C-alpha cells in the first residue's frame, strides 16, 4: 500500500572505529500517521547475510520527523573466520513494520590494522585489538519494498 514510514538519512557516528566498538547510527525517519504496531530496526553482519548484530524496537511509532540513535553491539571475532577480519565486509541496516521489511541499507566496510607497519606485515594470529573498521558511509545501497501497513488493501 501507500508508504507510512519512510527513511530519511543515516549518520554513521563513530567512524572509523575499533573492530570491537559498538556501532552508533543516528537514524532520521518520518512517520505520516499513527500506526498500530512496532518498527524493528536491525543490524546484520553479512561478510560472505550471515549474522544479526543487534535490533531495536520502537512502538508506538512517534508521528512526524524523528531522530534517534541506534547502538548495536559489534560482531564477535570468534563467530567469524579469520579470513574476514582484515578484508572488506558488509553491514546491513534494515527496518520492518509488523515483521514486514520495507527498507534496507547496505554499506561496505574496510577492516584494516591500526598502524602502517602492521598493515604491511600481517601476523599469522590476527590481533583483533588492533583492527580499525571504516564503514563507507558515503556510498550506501538503498533498497525499499512496498508493503501492507495498517490498511488491509
Amino acid at each position, epitope marked *: 500500500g501507500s508508504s507510512i514510514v519512510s527513511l530519511l538519512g543515516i*549518520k*554513521v*557516528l*563513530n*567512524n*572509523p*572505529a*575499533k573492530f570491537t*566498538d*559498538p556501532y*552508533e547510527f*543516528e537514524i532520521t525517519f518520518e512517520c505520516l500517521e499513527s500506526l498500530k504496531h512496532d518498527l524493528e530496526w536491525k543490524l546484520t553482519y553479512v561478510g560472505s547475510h550471515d549474522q544479526e548484530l543487534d535490533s*531495536i*524496537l*520502537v*512502538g*508506538p511509532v*512517534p508521528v*512526524g520527523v*524523528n*531522530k*534517534f*540513535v541506534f*547502538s548495536a553491539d559489534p560482531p564477535s571475532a570468534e563467530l567469524i573466520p579469520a579470513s574476514e577480519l582484515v578484508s572488506v565486509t558488509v553491514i546491513l541496516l534494515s527496518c520492518s513494520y509488523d515483521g514486514r521489511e520495507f527498507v534496507r541499507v547496505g554499506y561496505y566496510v574496510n577492516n584494516e590494522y591500526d598502524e602502517e607497519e602492521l598493515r604491511e606485515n600481517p601476523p599469522a594470529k590476527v590481533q583483533v585489538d588492533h583492527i580499525v573498521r571504516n564503514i563507507l*558511509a558515503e556510498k550506501p545501497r538503498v533498497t525499499r519494498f512496498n508493503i501492507v501497513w495498517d490498511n488491509e488493501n
Partner: antibody
Framework: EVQLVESGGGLVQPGGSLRLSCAASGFNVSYSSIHWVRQAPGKGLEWVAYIYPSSGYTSYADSVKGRFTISADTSKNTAYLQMNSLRAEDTAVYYC????????????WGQGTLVTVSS | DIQMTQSPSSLSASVGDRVTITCRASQSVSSAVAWYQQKPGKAPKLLIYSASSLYSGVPSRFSGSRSGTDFTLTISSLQPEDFATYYCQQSQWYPITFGQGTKVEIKR
C-alpha cells in the same frame, strides 16, 4: 587514568563570545563522543551538545542552535565549545563529559568551568 | 519531542530504607536510559547505564529497572553517603534529555 579538564570560563557581556576547552587524557578522543552539559545556578542538568571527533558529526540542543559550535582537535586530544551571542540565561557551570560504549551515557565528567553572562 | 518526567521531586528517607525513583518517558525507549548522582559542588557520577547495567565501581545497592515507559532507580537499603540529587537521562531520541532531578533528603 581517564580525566577531562575544562578551561575557558569566566565573565562576559550579553551578546559576546567565549570559547571553552576540554582536554582529554587517558583515552583516545576519536573513539568516543564528547558531550557538553551545563547547570544553571540551583537548577538541573541540561544537555547542550556533542561531537564524534572520528566523523566530525555533532548535535545541539534547541536552546543553543546557531549560537554554540562544538569542534574537536584530534591531535591535541581536545574538544572545544565556541559560544557566540551569549544571553544571560546561558549563565551556568559547563561540564565536558565523555561517552563510550554506554549508549551515550556519560561515564567521566570534568570538574566544570563557570560561565557568567551579564551587563 | 521527548520528555523525561521524573518523580518525585524531593524524597524523604532515613538510613536503611529501600528508596525508589521513577522516570517516565514520553515515548518508547528501548534501553538508552542512564541514572546519575550529583552532590552539591561536584560533577555528577554515572550510576547505571543502558536502563539496568550497573556502571563499574558503583555499589551494588543501586539497581535499574524498566516497566513499559517507566524507568526506575532502586536503592535497596539507603546508606548515609547516598543523600544526593539523582537525575535520569534518555539518549535514544534527539535531544538527549535529563530529568528534572530528585533530591533525597534526611527524614525527621
Amino acid at each position: 587514568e581517564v580525566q577531562l579538564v575544562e578551561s575557558g570560563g569566566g565573565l562576559v557581556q550579553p551578546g559576546g563570545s567565549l570559547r571553552l576547552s576540554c582536554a582529554a587524557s587517558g583515552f583516545n578522543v576519536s573513539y568516543s563522543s564528547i558531550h557538553w552539559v551545563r547547570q544553571a545556578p540551583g537548577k538541573g542538568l541540561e544537555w547542550v551538545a556533542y561531537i564524534y571527533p572520528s566523523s566530525g558529526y555533532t548535535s545541539y540542543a534547541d536552546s543553543v542552535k546557531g549560537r554554540f559550535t562544538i569542534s574537536a582537535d584530534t591531535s591535541k586530544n581536545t574538544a572545544y565549545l565556541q559560544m557566540n551571542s551569549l544571553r544571560a540565561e546561558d549563565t551556568a557551570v559547563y561540564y565536558c563529559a565523555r561517552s563510550y560504549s554506554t549508549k551515550l551515557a556519560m561515564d567521566y565528567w570534568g570538574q566544570g568551568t563557570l560561565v557568567t553572562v551579564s551587563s | 519531542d521527548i520528555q523525561m518526567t521524573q518523580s518525585p521531586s524531593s524524597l524523604s528517607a532515613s538510613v536503611g530504607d529501600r528508596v525508589t525513583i521513577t522516570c517516565r518517558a514520553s515515548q518508547s525507549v528501548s534501553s538508552a536510559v542512564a541514572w546519575y548522582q550529583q552532590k552539591p559542588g561536584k560533577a555528577p557520577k554515572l550510576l547505571i547505564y543502558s536502563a539496568s547495567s550497573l556502571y563499574s565501581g558503583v555499589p551494588s545497592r543501586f539497581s535499574g529497572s524498566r516497566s513499559g515507559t517507566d524507568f526506575t532507580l532502586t536503592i535497596s537499603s539507603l546508606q548515609p553517603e547516598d543523600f544526593a540529587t539523582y537525575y535520569c537521562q534518555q539518549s535514544q531520541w534527539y535531544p538527549i534529555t535529563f530529568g528534572q532531578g530528585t533530591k533525597v533528603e534526611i527524614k525527621r
